[model samples]
Target: NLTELSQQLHDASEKKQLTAIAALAEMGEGGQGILLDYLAKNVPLEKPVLAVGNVYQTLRNLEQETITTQLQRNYPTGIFPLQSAQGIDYLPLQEALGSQDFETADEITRDKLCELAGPGASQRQWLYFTEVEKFPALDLHTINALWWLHSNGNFGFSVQRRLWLASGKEFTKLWPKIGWKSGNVWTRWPKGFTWDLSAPQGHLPLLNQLRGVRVAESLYRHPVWSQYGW
Candidate 1:
């Protein structure tokens, strides 16, 4: 019956697939089997990407330790969709996010970006607008995908970019929109940030504003999303 049900999911419309996922969720081991099979088989495909996203949403909502552990073992990066243009290893970032160590994950994200910027930036421990502008879209997408998938679509550069656009592309508006600033003050560094799912959307993977907006702006303006649509 599960085999038949799994086949039906592949045949179903997107809406029907969601309903089927919900139905499978109720089937305990049977349901998880189908869901796991579906994710492992379909998530890598170009079509049904959104539908596969829904499957992830469903599995996350189930909140079972067994499922979570299994997923971590099989899909280390939440579908293992890691890609990079600079030959950088994203496994640490993936593991950090998988364990819900948001602060460590955030730090790792910054380091990865710095590494992408070349040795000078890595030594300086900061990036410049010119450096960010030269970043490869494939690598950026890999970083964004790790954040987006691990956070259940809650945080990523793409997510922040979407909010920035929604706020009329004003830093004054975007900062508050993403919980970085309130009123006339910026949120205090380290202690000020929420390091968990409780934070507002697009809150993690901080783009430091201390050096001014040029670096952050260049990142947001990167052709990663515009050219590839993330």
Candidate 2:
């Protein structure tokens, strides 16, 4: 299937199709670099530019010490210090759990779970507990996204929601066990929870209402993270 997909992408690029390149990138992971490189190399200057700016920016952030420090400090509090890396890996948390010149893999994993449970000492903690609390009606995309992030990868939260909607799974089967619900509006799920409206219609509609708000950017631009280049 991947081979077929790759060949199709190659043909699409050969035909100078920008939509085809965009589709391949949106597919995430799996040979994305090839398609991106092809576009960078061959696409004409006059067309709408789809340079891999985001990809390059992300890679640059990966090497910055300040980014790593912020991630280690804030990730355990259910706050995503870096938008792209949340649910991807607990590299910062892992470092925090270590003693000077001494660290174990088990300790790192345990600390990560503790952070996920919120800052309170008595709170319940588990790897998937946040997902359970936020959105119980797990679809294929949500499940896969969680697993992929747990295994060290990034899946844009919005993109995951789109995938869940595309999968056509029933909403009632996946409704979360806790959190508020008012008509078609549900709030206070996990940090990276994905919403599908046709399934429940509550949370999705509310989320859609706030679509254009740059809340994350505004919050990050505050003196706290902005001053430090986060």
Candidate 3:
């Protein structure tokens, strides 16, 4: 029955195929194993795996570990291997937000995010040019989704991106509207920044941790960037 269901993919309407993908994912982890072999075979003989972006990107949402394994085998490493060296994992961050510990959640988010973006103040200048592989962007989707789902509809990247548009894509207006700045001065670290409900609307996306402003140049091209828009 599962194989029969998966076979319908090539014939299903685009809209119907989307429904089918969700149906397969709902079949749970057992289905992911079956789905992978079938999905792997769909790779066009003349093309490389990276070119299968649509299928795998959707799969990233539905079945992460399997897709991640596929990418690791294909692209080897620059990110996944370095994650452990810097102690970053998204699982606990999800758990932290689940418990409503927003402060701890934001700190955990900023910590690993720094590691992903290349660690500490010495590396800050590099943020404008940072390039990363696909998975970290997927990693951030999970992170952004956490804050989006929680916080009673107050915070997340989608919210921040919307404000960015409302401000006519002006980073200057966008920053303070969300409280990353105050008056003529930048928020700065010793001044810290807002993490609680009292902070400005759309405050928790923490896009600034990505270095911000000129910092946004490379980030707008990241895989996850489309989810929030620029």
Candidate lDDT scores, in order, read: 0.81, 0.32, 0.56
Ranked by TM-score, top first: 1, 3, 2
User: In candidate 1, which residue pairs clash?
Assistant: none
Worst lDDT window (10 residues) for model 1?
A: 42-51
Error of 1 at 39 (Å): 1.3
Instruction: Kindly report which residue stretches of model 3 are placed more than 4 angstroms away from their true locations once superposed.
Output: 1-88, 117-128, 132-135, 188-192, 207-212, 225-230
- Scored by TM-score, the top model is 1
What alpha-carbon RMSD in Å does predicted model 3 have with respect to the real structure? Answer: 10.3
Model 2: worst 10 consecutive residues (lDDT sum): 200-209
Worst 10 residues of 3 by lDDT: 75-84
Model 3 C-alpha lDDT per residue in residues 87-160, reported as the tens digit of each score:
45665665555445677887777666666666453365333344443236655555565566445446766577
Ordering by lDDT: 1, 3, 2
Evaluate model 1: give its lDDT.
Answer: 0.81
Backbone clash numbers for all candidates listed: 0, 8, 0
